[PDB]
Design an enzyme around this catalytic site. Structure first.
Site, PDB file in Angstrom:
ATOM      1  N   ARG A 126       0.813  -1.197   0.000  1.00 17.62           N
ATOM      2  CA  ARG A 126       0.000   0.000   0.000  1.00 17.62           C
ATOM      3  C   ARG A 126       0.853   1.257   0.000  1.00 17.62           C
ATOM      4  O   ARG A 126       1.917   1.317   0.624  1.00 17.62           O
ATOM      5  CB  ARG A 126      -0.913   0.025   1.249  1.00 17.62           C
ATOM      6  CG  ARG A 126      -0.470   0.908   2.467  1.00 17.62           C
ATOM      7  CD  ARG A 126       0.411   0.109   3.440  1.00 17.62           C
ATOM      8  NE  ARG A 126       0.887   0.861   4.616  1.00 17.62           N
ATOM      9  CZ  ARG A 126       1.812   1.825   4.594  1.00 17.62           C
ATOM     10  NH1 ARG A 126       2.366   2.178   3.439  1.00 17.62           N
ATOM     11  NH2 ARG A 126       2.184   2.445   5.705  1.00 17.62           N
ATOM     12  N   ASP A 290      -1.818  -0.028  12.416  1.00 15.26           N
ATOM     13  CA  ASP A 290      -2.904   0.552  13.192  1.00 15.26           C
ATOM     14  C   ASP A 290      -3.654  -0.511  13.967  1.00 15.26           C
ATOM     15  O   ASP A 290      -4.000  -0.314  15.133  1.00 15.26           O
ATOM     16  CB  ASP A 290      -3.905   1.295  12.304  1.00 15.26           C
ATOM     17  CG  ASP A 290      -3.311   2.484  11.609  1.00 15.26           C
ATOM     18  OD1 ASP A 290      -2.278   3.022  12.058  1.00 15.26           O
ATOM     19  OD2 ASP A 290      -3.897   2.872  10.565  1.00 15.26           O
TER      20      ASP A 290
END
Ligand SMILES: Nc1ncnc2c1ncn2[C@@H]1O[C@H](COP(=O)(O)OP(=O)(O)CP(=O)(O)O)[C@@H](O)[C@H]1O
Ligand SMILES: Nc1ncnc2c1[C@@H](I)NN2[C@@H]1O[C@H](CO)[C@@H](O)[C@H]1O
Ligand SMILES: [Cl-]
Ligand SMILES: [Mg+2]
Length: 330
Positions: A126, A290
């Site tokens: 990503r 996260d």
């Protein structure tokens, strides 16, 4: 207590799309990087429509706190503050948060648009490119302490330094005067470490738990002195009758390294293996870090041990990486 974790962050909307390498090239992006959009990259936002993107709430700290709230379930278990624009987008993020039971107090930046981040997936990696918009005007209200009344875990991402370091500094300073309270911080990205050196320095001194990936600490080593294990033990000096002092370094599929300085001065290090996940099963790595922090914070809040916290973090991250973009399943 009611609120267990309180965090500040940049509430943003993510636009996720799988794109060809040529797209990354045309937009001057480096595969796997995380940056703020330059003027020449502003066009990415409109051009993504041709890739049939999907849209969902984003924002690093926000993803983290949502995981905690999801796991603690009770309303207001996790609290968050940040700034959204006075646009429809901001309203959507807000409604979604409300539906999750998260406690929030968003500041609205009139005439500004809610932040947006393009999450570009290529191969299985990503690259993030965000336009902060309203996030940059965030200013902590002076009554924030009341809103976060009862939390013992305070968290902030280094991404929040872009608006102003004062925000994270006030949170840290307040946690510092509270017994049993801990301030946790995420290095968030290379650019943060590189650009906010002075502020970070003052913040680190008041940080109890520092999170980051191998890439992030490397820059921290360079920017500072010290220059895996050594880098990790190195960073502990920056933070350094026992107030928690722990550094947690994630390293993709490599074992997680956690170094802690105990009350007596003894440095304890833990190298925790990460369960193997078949590469063909990996969807995309967006939000792995996260989710890891979210699992970690949830566990810490449950009094679990450092090793157990890492395990919980590993579990959340593994699930999320087997899904497109971020995912709140479990
Ligand atoms: N190949 C892999 N196999 C298994 N787990 C992996 C993995 N890559 C990452 N993870 C899991 O996610 C955790 C954090 O990974 P890492 O920090 O390297 O993600 P990241 O920085 O890409 C995330 P973001 O997109 O949120 O910035 C690891 O500790 C591990 O639990
Ligand atoms: N500057 C900044 N601030 C907050 N969140 C951010 C970013 C950037 I470049 N990327 N992200 C968020 O990181 C998550 C992935 O870890 C995504 O949801 C994305 O919105
Ligand atoms: Cl954030
Ligand atoms: Mg990764």
């Amino acid at each position: 207590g009611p609120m267990r974790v309180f965090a500040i962050g940049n509430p943003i909307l993510d636009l996720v799309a799988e794109v060809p390498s040529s797209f990354l090239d045309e937009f001057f992006l480096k595969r796997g990087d995380a940056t703020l959009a330059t003027p020449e990259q502003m066009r990415i936002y409109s051009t993504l429509d041709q890739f049939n993107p999907t849209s969902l709430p984003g924002g690093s700290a926000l993803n983290s706190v949502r995981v905690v709230q999801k796991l603690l379930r009770k309303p207001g278990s996790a609290g968050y503050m940040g700034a959204i624009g006075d646009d429809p987008r901001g309203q959507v993020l807000k409604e979604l948060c409300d539906k999750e039971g998260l406690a929030t107090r968003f500041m609205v930046a009139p005439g500004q648009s809610t932040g947006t981040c393009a999450v570009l997936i290529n191969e299985k990696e990503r690259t993030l490119c965000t336009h902060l918009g309203a996030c940059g005007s965030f200013r902590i209200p002076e009554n924030w302490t009341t809103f976060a009344s009862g939390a013992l875990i305070f968290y902030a991402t280094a991404y929040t330094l872009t608006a102003t370091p004062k925000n994270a500094l006030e949170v840290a300073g307040y946690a510092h005067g509270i017994p049993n309270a801990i301030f946790t911080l995420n290095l968030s990205a290379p650019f943060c470490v590189e650009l906010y050196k002075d502020a970070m320095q003052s913040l680190l001194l008041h940080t109890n738990i520092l999170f980051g990936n191998e890439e992030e600490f490397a820059h921290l080593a360079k920017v500072h002195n010290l220059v895996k294990v050594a880098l990790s033990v190195a960073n502990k000096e920056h933070a350094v009758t026992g107030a928690t002092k722990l550094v947690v370094m994630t390293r993709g599929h490599n074992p997680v390294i956690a170094a802690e300085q105990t009350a007596d001065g003894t440095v304890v290090v833990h190298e925790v293996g990460v369960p193997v996940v078949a590469a063909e099963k990996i969807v995309d790595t967006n939000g792995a870090g996260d989710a890891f922090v979210g699992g970690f914070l949830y566990g810490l809040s449950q009094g679990k041990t450092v090793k157990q916290c890492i395990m919980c973090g590993n579990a959340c991250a593994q699930d999320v990486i087997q899904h497109v973009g971020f995912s709140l399943s479990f």
